[PDB]
Design a protein around this ligand. Sequence first.
Ligand SMILES: Cc1cc2nc3c(=O)[nH]c(=O)nc-3n(C[C@H](O)[C@H](O)[C@H](O)COP(=O)(O)O)c2cc1C
Length: 324
Amino acid sequence: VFRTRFTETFGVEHPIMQGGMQWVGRAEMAAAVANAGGLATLSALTQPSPEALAAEIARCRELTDRPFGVNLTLLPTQKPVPYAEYRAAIIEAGIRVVETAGNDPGEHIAEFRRHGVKVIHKCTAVRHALKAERLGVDAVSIDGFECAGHPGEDDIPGLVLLPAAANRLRVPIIASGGFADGRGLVAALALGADAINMGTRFLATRECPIHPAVKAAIRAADERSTDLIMRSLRNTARVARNAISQEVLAIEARGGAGYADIAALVSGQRGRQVYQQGDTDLGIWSAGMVQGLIDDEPACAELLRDIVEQARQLVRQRLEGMLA
Ligand SMILES: Cc1cc2nc3c(=O)[nH]c(=O)nc-3n(C[C@H](O)[C@H](O)[C@H](O)COP(=O)(O)O)c2cc1C
Protein backbone atom coordinates (compact mmCIF):
# COMPACT_ATOMS: atom_id res chain seq x y z
CA VAL A 1 0.00 0.00 0.00
CA PHE A 2 2.69 2.47 1.04
CA ARG A 3 6.15 2.66 -0.50
CA THR A 4 8.73 4.61 1.50
CA ARG A 5 12.46 4.98 2.05
CA PHE A 6 11.93 2.57 4.93
CA THR A 7 10.22 -0.20 2.97
CA GLU A 8 12.76 0.08 0.17
CA THR A 9 15.79 0.26 2.47
CA PHE A 10 14.79 -2.70 4.62
CA GLY A 11 12.80 -4.77 2.13
CA VAL A 12 9.49 -5.05 3.94
CA GLU A 13 5.92 -4.63 2.68
CA HIS A 14 4.69 -2.07 5.23
CA PRO A 15 6.38 0.99 6.80
CA ILE A 16 5.75 -0.52 10.21
CA MET A 17 8.29 -1.82 12.67
CA GLN A 18 8.10 -3.78 15.93
CA GLY A 19 11.17 -2.66 17.84
CA GLY A 20 12.86 -3.92 20.97
CA MET A 21 10.67 -5.51 23.61
CA GLN A 22 12.42 -6.93 26.68
CA TRP A 23 10.78 -10.17 27.89
CA VAL A 24 8.11 -9.84 25.17
CA GLY A 25 10.22 -9.82 22.00
CA ARG A 26 10.31 -13.58 21.56
CA ALA A 27 9.92 -15.86 18.54
CA GLU A 28 6.10 -15.68 18.57
CA MET A 29 6.02 -11.88 18.49
CA ALA A 30 8.69 -11.46 15.80
CA ALA A 31 7.34 -14.18 13.53
CA ALA A 32 3.83 -12.70 13.68
CA VAL A 33 5.06 -9.21 12.77
CA ALA A 34 7.39 -10.62 10.11
CA ASN A 35 4.57 -12.67 8.57
CA ALA A 36 2.36 -9.56 8.77
CA GLY A 37 4.57 -7.59 6.40
CA GLY A 38 6.45 -5.43 8.88
CA LEU A 39 9.98 -5.26 10.25
CA ALA A 40 10.15 -7.47 13.36
CA THR A 41 12.81 -7.91 16.04
CA LEU A 42 13.79 -10.58 18.54
CA SER A 43 14.98 -9.05 21.80
CA ALA A 44 18.62 -10.09 22.22
CA LEU A 45 18.84 -9.43 25.95
CA THR A 46 15.57 -11.26 26.61
CA GLN A 47 17.71 -14.33 25.98
CA PRO A 48 19.97 -15.10 28.99
CA SER A 49 23.01 -16.01 26.87
CA PRO A 50 24.41 -15.55 23.35
CA GLU A 51 23.79 -19.25 22.76
CA ALA A 52 20.17 -18.89 23.87
CA LEU A 53 19.75 -16.06 21.35
CA ALA A 54 21.07 -18.35 18.62
CA ALA A 55 18.51 -20.96 19.63
CA GLU A 56 15.71 -18.37 19.72
CA ILE A 57 16.71 -17.07 16.28
CA ALA A 58 16.44 -20.64 14.97
CA ARG A 59 13.11 -21.14 16.73
CA CYS A 60 11.76 -17.95 15.16
CA ARG A 61 12.81 -19.14 11.69
CA GLU A 62 10.62 -22.20 12.26
CA LEU A 63 7.62 -19.87 12.56
CA THR A 64 8.45 -17.50 9.70
CA ASP A 65 10.38 -17.66 6.42
CA ARG A 66 10.48 -13.86 6.23
CA PRO A 67 13.51 -11.80 7.34
CA PHE A 68 13.47 -10.27 10.82
CA GLY A 69 15.93 -8.24 12.85
CA VAL A 70 17.35 -8.29 16.34
CA ASN A 71 17.30 -5.60 18.98
CA LEU A 72 20.47 -5.02 20.97
CA THR A 73 19.72 -2.72 23.88
CA LEU A 74 22.74 -1.24 25.62
CA LEU A 75 21.85 -1.53 29.30
CA PRO A 76 23.74 0.79 31.70
CA THR A 77 24.17 -2.08 34.19
CA GLN A 78 27.79 -2.53 35.25
CA LYS A 79 27.10 -6.25 35.50
CA PRO A 80 28.65 -8.84 33.11
CA VAL A 81 27.13 -8.18 29.68
CA PRO A 82 29.00 -10.00 26.84
CA TYR A 83 27.62 -7.71 24.12
CA ALA A 84 30.44 -8.70 21.76
CA GLU A 85 29.45 -12.38 21.95
CA TYR A 86 25.80 -11.47 21.43
CA ARG A 87 26.79 -9.47 18.33
CA ALA A 88 28.84 -12.40 17.10
CA ALA A 89 25.84 -14.66 17.61
CA ILE A 90 23.57 -12.25 15.71
CA ILE A 91 26.10 -11.99 12.88
CA GLU A 92 26.93 -15.69 12.65
CA ALA A 93 23.18 -16.38 12.43
CA GLY A 94 22.88 -14.27 9.29
CA ILE A 95 20.72 -11.48 10.70
CA ARG A 96 20.58 -8.70 8.09
CA VAL A 97 19.26 -5.88 10.28
CA VAL A 98 19.74 -4.80 13.88
CA GLU A 99 18.07 -2.16 16.02
CA THR A 100 20.48 -0.74 18.57
CA ALA A 101 19.48 1.44 21.52
CA GLY A 102 21.06 2.97 24.58
CA ASN A 103 24.31 4.82 25.24
CA ASP A 104 27.44 4.83 23.09
CA PRO A 105 26.37 2.43 20.31
CA GLY A 106 29.44 3.34 18.25
CA GLU A 107 31.47 0.20 18.94
CA HIS A 108 28.59 -2.15 18.11
CA ILE A 109 27.26 -0.19 15.15
CA ALA A 110 30.67 -0.26 13.46
CA GLU A 111 31.00 -4.02 13.94
CA PHE A 112 27.58 -4.76 12.45
CA ARG A 113 28.38 -2.58 9.43
CA ARG A 114 31.68 -4.39 8.83
CA HIS A 115 29.66 -7.57 8.30
CA GLY A 116 26.96 -6.22 6.00
CA VAL A 117 24.37 -5.90 8.77
CA LYS A 118 22.24 -2.77 8.45
CA VAL A 119 21.72 -0.81 11.66
CA ILE A 120 18.67 1.11 12.85
CA HIS A 121 19.59 3.16 15.92
CA LYS A 122 16.89 4.36 18.28
CA CYS A 123 17.68 7.67 19.96
CA THR A 124 15.86 10.35 21.92
CA ALA A 125 17.27 13.61 20.59
CA VAL A 126 18.29 15.22 17.31
CA ARG A 127 21.90 15.61 18.49
CA HIS A 128 22.04 11.85 19.21
CA ALA A 129 20.56 10.95 15.83
CA LEU A 130 23.14 13.15 14.07
CA LYS A 131 26.01 11.56 15.99
CA ALA A 132 24.58 8.18 14.98
CA GLU A 133 24.25 9.30 11.36
CA ARG A 134 27.91 10.33 11.43
CA LEU A 135 28.67 6.85 12.77
CA GLY A 136 27.14 5.29 9.68
CA VAL A 137 23.71 3.95 10.62
CA ASP A 138 21.29 2.94 7.87
CA ALA A 139 18.42 4.68 9.63
CA VAL A 140 17.48 6.44 12.84
CA SER A 141 14.49 5.70 15.02
CA ILE A 142 13.36 8.98 16.61
CA ASP A 143 11.85 8.09 19.99
CA GLY A 144 9.56 10.77 21.44
CA PHE A 145 8.40 11.68 24.95
CA GLU A 146 5.27 9.53 24.45
CA CYS A 147 7.23 6.28 24.18
CA ALA A 148 7.12 3.28 26.47
CA GLY A 149 10.64 2.75 27.83
CA HIS A 150 13.43 5.34 28.04
CA PRO A 151 12.55 8.71 26.43
CA GLY A 152 15.70 10.39 27.71
CA GLU A 153 15.57 13.61 29.73
CA ASP A 154 14.65 16.35 27.23
CA ASP A 155 10.90 15.70 27.29
CA ILE A 156 10.23 16.55 23.64
CA PRO A 157 7.10 14.89 22.13
CA GLY A 158 7.21 13.53 18.58
CA LEU A 159 5.05 16.30 17.16
CA VAL A 160 8.09 18.59 17.52
CA LEU A 161 11.04 16.19 17.80
CA LEU A 162 10.17 14.45 14.51
CA PRO A 163 10.20 17.52 12.27
CA ALA A 164 13.20 18.88 14.19
CA ALA A 165 15.06 15.68 13.30
CA ALA A 166 13.82 15.60 9.72
CA ASN A 167 15.17 19.15 9.38
CA ARG A 168 18.70 17.84 9.94
CA LEU A 169 18.91 14.11 9.15
CA ARG A 170 19.51 12.58 5.70
CA VAL A 171 19.10 8.85 6.34
CA PRO A 172 15.61 7.32 6.63
CA ILE A 173 13.64 8.14 9.79
CA ILE A 174 11.37 5.91 11.86
CA ALA A 175 8.90 7.72 14.14
CA SER A 176 8.71 5.99 17.52
CA GLY A 177 6.49 6.56 20.54
CA GLY A 178 2.80 7.37 20.68
CA PHE A 179 1.73 5.57 17.49
CA ALA A 180 -1.03 2.98 17.24
CA ASP A 181 -3.06 3.43 14.06
CA GLY A 182 -3.33 4.86 10.55
CA ARG A 183 -3.83 8.39 11.84
CA GLY A 184 -0.46 8.17 13.55
CA LEU A 185 1.20 6.75 10.43
CA VAL A 186 0.07 9.65 8.23
CA ALA A 187 1.03 12.18 10.91
CA ALA A 188 4.48 10.62 11.17
CA LEU A 189 4.91 10.54 7.38
CA ALA A 190 3.75 14.16 7.08
CA LEU A 191 6.20 15.24 9.78
CA GLY A 192 9.18 13.83 7.90
CA ALA A 193 9.34 10.20 8.96
CA ASP A 194 9.27 7.25 6.56
CA ALA A 195 7.85 4.68 8.96
CA ILE A 196 6.52 4.16 12.46
CA ASN A 197 7.77 1.95 15.26
CA MET A 198 5.37 0.59 17.87
CA GLY A 199 5.69 -1.32 21.12
CA THR A 200 2.54 -0.95 23.22
CA ARG A 201 0.26 -1.55 20.22
CA PHE A 202 1.93 -4.94 19.72
CA LEU A 203 1.29 -6.00 23.31
CA ALA A 204 -2.39 -5.82 22.41
CA THR A 205 -2.30 -8.39 19.62
CA ARG A 206 -3.29 -12.05 19.53
CA GLU A 207 0.21 -13.46 18.94
CA CYS A 208 2.00 -11.41 21.60
CA PRO A 209 3.21 -14.18 23.97
CA ILE A 210 2.01 -12.59 27.22
CA HIS A 211 -0.71 -13.34 29.76
CA PRO A 212 -4.21 -12.28 28.64
CA ALA A 213 -4.67 -10.14 31.77
CA VAL A 214 -1.84 -7.87 30.62
CA LYS A 215 -3.49 -7.44 27.23
CA ALA A 216 -6.71 -6.72 29.12
CA ALA A 217 -5.01 -4.05 31.28
CA ILE A 218 -3.72 -2.17 28.22
CA ARG A 219 -7.26 -2.14 26.82
CA ALA A 220 -8.72 -0.76 30.05
CA ALA A 221 -6.03 1.89 30.58
CA ASP A 222 -6.45 5.50 29.44
CA GLU A 223 -3.60 7.73 28.22
CA ARG A 224 -3.14 9.18 31.71
CA SER A 225 -2.16 5.84 33.25
CA THR A 226 1.63 5.64 32.94
CA ASP A 227 4.34 6.81 35.31
CA LEU A 228 7.82 8.21 34.71
CA ILE A 229 10.03 6.43 37.21
CA MET A 230 13.62 7.23 38.09
CA ARG A 231 13.41 10.84 36.94
CA SER A 232 15.45 11.87 39.99
CA LEU A 233 18.14 9.44 38.79
CA ARG A 234 18.12 10.79 35.23
CA ASN A 235 17.26 7.28 34.08
CA THR A 236 13.63 8.08 33.29
CA ALA A 237 11.42 5.23 32.10
CA ARG A 238 7.72 5.30 31.20
CA VAL A 239 5.94 2.29 32.64
CA ALA A 240 2.41 1.10 33.27
CA ARG A 241 1.03 2.77 36.36
CA ASN A 242 0.69 0.24 39.17
CA ALA A 243 1.37 -0.17 42.88
CA ILE A 244 5.06 -0.66 42.15
CA SER A 245 5.63 2.43 39.99
CA GLN A 246 3.64 4.50 42.49
CA GLU A 247 5.86 3.17 45.28
CA VAL A 248 9.12 4.09 43.54
CA LEU A 249 7.72 7.57 42.92
CA ALA A 250 7.00 7.87 46.65
CA ILE A 251 10.58 6.84 47.44
CA GLU A 252 11.99 9.35 44.95
CA ALA A 253 9.68 12.03 46.32
CA ARG A 254 11.13 11.54 49.82
CA GLY A 255 14.56 12.64 48.63
CA GLY A 256 18.06 11.18 48.68
CA ALA A 257 16.99 8.21 46.58
CA GLY A 258 19.62 5.88 45.15
CA TYR A 259 19.16 3.00 42.72
CA ALA A 260 19.85 0.49 45.50
CA ASP A 261 16.78 1.89 47.27
CA ILE A 262 14.52 0.83 44.39
CA ALA A 263 16.49 -1.98 42.75
CA ALA A 264 14.30 -4.67 44.29
CA LEU A 265 11.18 -2.87 43.05
CA VAL A 266 12.38 -2.30 39.47
CA SER A 267 13.80 -5.82 39.28
CA GLY A 268 13.69 -7.24 35.76
CA GLN A 269 13.00 -10.66 37.23
CA ARG A 270 9.99 -9.21 39.03
CA GLY A 271 8.91 -7.42 35.86
CA ARG A 272 9.15 -10.48 33.63
CA GLN A 273 6.52 -12.21 35.77
CA VAL A 274 3.90 -9.58 34.97
CA TYR A 275 3.85 -10.96 31.41
CA GLN A 276 3.97 -14.64 32.34
CA GLN A 277 1.61 -14.58 35.35
CA GLY A 278 -0.63 -11.66 34.43
CA ASP A 279 -0.13 -10.00 37.82
CA THR A 280 0.07 -6.38 36.63
CA ASP A 281 1.16 -5.31 40.13
CA LEU A 282 3.96 -7.86 40.56
CA GLY A 283 6.50 -5.42 39.18
CA ILE A 284 7.49 -2.76 36.71
CA TRP A 285 6.40 -3.27 33.12
CA SER A 286 6.67 -1.01 30.09
CA ALA A 287 3.61 0.62 28.55
CA GLY A 288 3.12 3.82 26.57
CA MET A 289 0.46 6.49 26.93
CA VAL A 290 -0.76 5.45 23.49
CA GLN A 291 -2.57 2.69 25.39
CA GLY A 292 -5.48 5.13 25.65
CA LEU A 293 -6.07 4.65 21.90
CA ILE A 294 -6.05 0.86 22.13
CA ASP A 295 -9.06 -1.26 23.05
CA ASP A 296 -8.95 -4.26 20.73
CA GLU A 297 -6.78 -7.32 20.10
CA PRO A 298 -6.40 -8.11 16.39
CA ALA A 299 -4.07 -10.61 14.76
CA CYS A 300 -0.88 -8.86 13.67
CA ALA A 301 -1.72 -9.52 10.02
CA GLU A 302 -5.01 -7.63 10.09
CA LEU A 303 -3.59 -4.91 12.37
CA LEU A 304 -0.83 -3.90 9.94
CA ARG A 305 -3.25 -4.31 7.05
CA ASP A 306 -5.85 -2.06 8.69
CA ILE A 307 -3.31 0.60 9.68
CA VAL A 308 -2.05 1.17 6.14
CA GLU A 309 -5.57 0.88 4.76
CA GLN A 310 -6.77 3.44 7.30
CA ALA A 311 -3.82 5.67 6.42
CA ARG A 312 -4.47 5.42 2.68
CA GLN A 313 -8.12 6.33 3.23
CA LEU A 314 -7.16 9.34 5.35
CA VAL A 315 -5.10 10.64 2.45
CA ARG A 316 -7.48 9.90 -0.43
CA GLN A 317 -10.71 10.53 1.50
CA ARG A 318 -10.18 13.00 4.34
CA LEU A 319 -7.16 15.02 3.17
CA GLU A 320 -7.91 15.05 -0.58
CA GLY A 321 -11.50 15.78 0.40
CA MET A 322 -10.51 19.00 2.16
CA LEU A 323 -8.55 20.05 -0.94
CA ALA A 324 -11.38 19.25 -3.36
C1 LIG B 1 6.80 -4.32 27.03
C2 LIG B 1 7.77 -3.37 26.31
C3 LIG B 1 9.20 -3.71 26.37
C4 LIG B 1 10.17 -2.83 25.68
N1 LIG B 1 11.53 -3.11 25.69
C5 LIG B 1 12.60 -2.46 25.11
C6 LIG B 1 13.94 -2.86 25.18
O1 LIG B 1 14.36 -3.85 25.77
N2 LIG B 1 14.86 -2.02 24.48
C7 LIG B 1 14.55 -0.85 23.75
O2 LIG B 1 15.43 -0.21 23.19
N3 LIG B 1 13.23 -0.50 23.71
C8 LIG B 1 12.27 -1.25 24.36
N4 LIG B 1 10.86 -0.93 24.34
C9 LIG B 1 10.48 0.34 23.56
C10 LIG B 1 9.89 0.08 22.15
O3 LIG B 1 10.79 -0.61 21.30
C11 LIG B 1 9.48 1.40 21.47
O4 LIG B 1 10.59 2.28 21.30
C12 LIG B 1 8.31 2.10 22.24
O5 LIG B 1 7.37 1.12 22.74
C13 LIG B 1 7.48 3.02 21.39
O6 LIG B 1 6.42 3.55 22.15
P1 LIG B 1 4.94 3.05 22.08
O7 LIG B 1 4.82 2.11 23.21
O8 LIG B 1 4.17 4.26 22.34
O9 LIG B 1 4.73 2.39 20.77
C14 LIG B 1 9.78 -1.66 24.96
C15 LIG B 1 8.34 -1.33 24.93
C16 LIG B 1 7.33 -2.15 25.58
C17 LIG B 1 5.85 -1.67 25.43
